[PDB]
Amino acid sequence: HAIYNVEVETGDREHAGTDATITIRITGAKGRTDYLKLDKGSFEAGSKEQYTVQGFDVGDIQLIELHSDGGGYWSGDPDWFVNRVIIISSTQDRVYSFPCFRWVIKDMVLFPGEATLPFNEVPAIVSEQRQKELEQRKLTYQWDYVSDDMPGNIKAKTHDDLPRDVQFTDEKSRSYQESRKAALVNLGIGSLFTMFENWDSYDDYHILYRNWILGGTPNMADRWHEDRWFGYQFLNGANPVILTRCDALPSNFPVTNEHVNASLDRGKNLDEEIKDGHIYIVDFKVLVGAKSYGGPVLEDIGYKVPDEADIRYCAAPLALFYVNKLGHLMPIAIQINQEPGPENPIWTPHEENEHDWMMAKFWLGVAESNFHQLNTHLLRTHLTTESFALSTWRNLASAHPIFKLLQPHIYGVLAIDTIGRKEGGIVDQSLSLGGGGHVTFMEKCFKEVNLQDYHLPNALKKRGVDDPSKLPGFYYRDDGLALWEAIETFIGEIIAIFYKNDDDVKRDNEIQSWIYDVHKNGWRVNPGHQDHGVPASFESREQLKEVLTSLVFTFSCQHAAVNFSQKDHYGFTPNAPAILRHPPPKKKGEATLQSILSTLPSKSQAAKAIATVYILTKFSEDERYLGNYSATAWEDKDALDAINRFQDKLEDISKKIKQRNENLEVPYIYLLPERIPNGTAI
Ligand SMILES: [Ca+2]
Ligand SMILES: [Ca+2]
Ligand SMILES: [Ca+2]
Ligand SMILES: [Cl-]
Ligand SMILES: [Fe+2]
């Protein structure tokens, strides 16, 4: 016989413990034990428990199987989250270490030692069990679709229908459900306080963030009305993804030197500034044809010739910006809709009537808000990356090194996206496109999505926004690029530990199925779709790196930059309205403060926008931030060294951002590693 010393580490998360009866079967080269009882004492969350069981001597241990009887009549929560099992056999001179970091329901198979690719040499019984795991994953983790024009999501009726490995922790559930209760309370309290106010100035909106715990006053509250800070936010606000270098005006945007000359300040006219690379543009054309709430449909001309019903408007503006001699991005011209003419003219900061320029900025702001929330945030982080999270569960075995790499980063997205698909939520009460056009709009955007868009260096280059001498003070870019490189370096080092060359990439059928599943069933090239840029297979380590870097960066950094920026951005509503209530003007000279206030969001619309931001930006008490791999399943020493390097590099990037920030009038904090969750979980 053999003596086996067995130590089980239980996860610290809530409900991690069990009082199920637990047994363990040990398999090795010589045979296998029966199920042996792990009998005395409790399995509490965070516990490290020791057992000595005796049984057939299996020789060199090859795998183990844990069994839970699923508890008895009184068991509150028999599911048991196991971190690791360590075993010493009295007959083998070594320590077997079995990473888990997954929920044990009834049966769990675990292998000792380092991650392997499916073709690495292992006992046949290990290979058979790997295949059984993958077969089982394909039944639990299934595709489903909002429509032919949306990226694949997880099939699940409600959150509690998700497999436990992909549900929120009980901590995240509490964080989330508690934040909805507080939103409702803060709304009701605020509604009482402001019940009989007549809103008659921009400054009345400050009341609305005042009884909310937001992390501080939105940092644009004192400056939103200055052109300089309006422009700044196209670089450093919630939507830093659409501005591009203008190398020629669009044909439908006929801004002349005479429109903007009073704004230029380096001694050159528009044509020269265009050639000098100091002219930048955003074009919201994708918003043409959008159906806003109450029924208006956006046209190239705006809206046709139409009591207080809830009717909302949006725009498809172009706007032109100029980097002035002090390095500030200045807004210099806005055309509210696509089709130039006397009814859709060009507004500049030199309007005879100052209210007309303000109103033009609000229309540009409403376009941006609906674009940002639906395309930039929801679709391009949450919904699109969700397909890859799902594929990872379907196709990558738990012993696979790239399963182990992705685990900290895919966590959360399935949970929150399933919740969201249930939670007339908001959307609906706080966005002009709420009520159903928001789905059509994301479909519209999805048809253009390409995987190459998720490549940060390439996208910035392509936009022409990557030269700090022509476009200064772009901290999303600077911090983004430093994080991208750190992530890429680390991912490259992981790959090299397990893939020794490109044939290893080609021979790995799991990584091949992983990418193929997204290509075929995830980002489906359907009728009317552009190619989505997802490869059908992998041919090289470098290609494998690029895709994993895109993906990890997007889960963590990109989602953080466009999500957690929302308090500063939307907290003071006039800085970024997401609903407007009247149609654009058809001539100059009509705007007054009063007409402007009746166009801007109402008090409850603005309050419901703040409530949404409060929910979508609440970090949970158990959040893990970028590089914090304390709940990961790695055993390989070289992999742990790579992790060490990555963490020291993030720490260096962190200090550097802090030192940059202390010389900034408005520090840029959303891409600090300690503020970037590993994943998209809210
Ligand atoms: Ca439990
Ligand atoms: Ca004990
Ligand atoms: Ca370490
Ligand atoms: Cl490993
Ligand atoms: Fe989010």
mmCIF file with all atom_site columns, N, CA, C and O and ligand atoms in Angstrom, residues 377 382 559 563 682, ligand 5:
data_model
loop_
_atom_site.group_PDB
_atom_site.id
_atom_site.type_symbol
_atom_site.label_atom_id
_atom_site.label_alt_id
_atom_site.label_comp_id
_atom_site.label_asym_id
_atom_site.label_entity_id
_atom_site.label_seq_id
_atom_site.pdbx_PDB_ins_code
_atom_site.Cartn_x
_atom_site.Cartn_y
_atom_site.Cartn_z
_atom_site.occupancy
_atom_site.B_iso_or_equiv
_atom_site.pdbx_formal_charge
_atom_site.auth_seq_id
_atom_site.auth_comp_id
_atom_site.auth_asym_id
_atom_site.auth_atom_id
_atom_site.pdbx_PDB_model_num
ATOM   1  N  N  . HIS A 1 377 ? -18.605 51.351 -25.920 1.00 0.00 ? 377 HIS A N  1
ATOM   2  C  CA . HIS A 1 377 ? -18.605 50.587 -24.684 1.00 0.00 ? 377 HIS A CA 1
ATOM   3  C  C  . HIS A 1 377 ? -19.296 49.244 -24.835 1.00 0.00 ? 377 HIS A C  1
ATOM   4  O  O  . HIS A 1 377 ? -18.656 48.213 -24.767 1.00 0.00 ? 377 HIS A O  1
ATOM   5  N  N  . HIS A 1 382 ? -17.840 44.787 -24.039 1.00 0.00 ? 382 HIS A N  1
ATOM   6  C  CA . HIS A 1 382 ? -18.759 43.740 -23.589 1.00 0.00 ? 382 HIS A CA 1
ATOM   7  C  C  . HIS A 1 382 ? -19.107 42.669 -24.664 1.00 0.00 ? 382 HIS A C  1
ATOM   8  O  O  . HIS A 1 382 ? -18.659 41.505 -24.572 1.00 0.00 ? 382 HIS A O  1
ATOM   9  N  N  . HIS A 1 559 ? -11.818 48.532 -21.815 1.00 0.00 ? 559 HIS A N  1
ATOM   10 C  CA . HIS A 1 559 ? -13.067 48.660 -21.051 1.00 0.00 ? 559 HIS A CA 1
ATOM   11 C  C  . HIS A 1 559 ? -12.899 49.656 -19.894 1.00 0.00 ? 559 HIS A C  1
ATOM   12 O  O  . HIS A 1 559 ? -13.806 50.487 -19.635 1.00 0.00 ? 559 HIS A O  1
ATOM   13 N  N  . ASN A 1 563 ? -15.187 53.003 -19.602 1.00 0.00 ? 563 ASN A N  1
ATOM   14 C  CA . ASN A 1 563 ? -16.269 52.734 -18.664 1.00 0.00 ? 563 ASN A CA 1
ATOM   15 C  C  . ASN A 1 563 ? -16.088 53.571 -17.433 1.00 0.00 ? 563 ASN A C  1
ATOM   16 O  O  . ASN A 1 563 ? -16.994 54.353 -17.051 1.00 0.00 ? 563 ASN A O  1
ATOM   17 N  N  . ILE A 1 682 ? -18.412 44.832 -15.352 1.00 0.00 ? 682 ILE A N  1
ATOM   18 C  CA . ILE A 1 682 ? -19.490 45.744 -14.969 1.00 0.00 ? 682 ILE A CA 1
ATOM   19 C  C  . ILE A 1 682 ? -19.786 46.723 -16.119 1.00 0.00 ? 682 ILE A C  1
ATOM   20 O  O  . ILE A 1 682 ? -20.805 47.459 -16.042 1.00 0.00 ? 682 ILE A O  1
HETATM 21 FE FE . FE  B 2 .   ? -18.849 47.993 -18.865 1.00 0.00 ? 5   FE  B FE 1
#
